[PDB]
């Protein structure tokens, strides 16, 4: 029964998907900084 293995694969993947999203939204918080600055 492999089972354990593939039920680990779903964790790794989720935290890679998670990680993509996070750095993604960081870029948004980055464009927010310039958006104030460029006006200031």
């Amino acid at each position: 029964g492999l089972i354990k293995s593939l039920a680990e694969k779903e964790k790794q993947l989720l935290e890679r998907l998670e990680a993509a999203k996070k750095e993604a939204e960081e870029r948004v918080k980055r464009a927010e900084a310039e958006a104030k600055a460029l006006l200031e």
């Binding site: 029964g1 089972i3 354990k4 593939l6 039920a7 680990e8 779903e10 964790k11």
Partner: protein, 50 residues
């Protein structure tokens, strides 16, 4: 009187169900930390198995 019935009822289910549940749980283990894979338990004896 109620309590007595209830206790009996608990035991009856609990003994019967105990064996499939540990066995199924052992097979299932690693998916029952949070299904993110979806699982279906079922009991079958020899005939249904193919």
């Amino acid at each position: 009187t109620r309590q007595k019935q209830e206790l009996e009822e608990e035991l009856a289910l609990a003994q019967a169900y105990l064996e499939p549940l540990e066995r199924l749980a052992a097979l299932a283990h690693g998916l029952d930390k949070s299904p993110f894979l979806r699982v279906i338990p079922f009991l079958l004896t020899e005939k249904e198995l193919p």
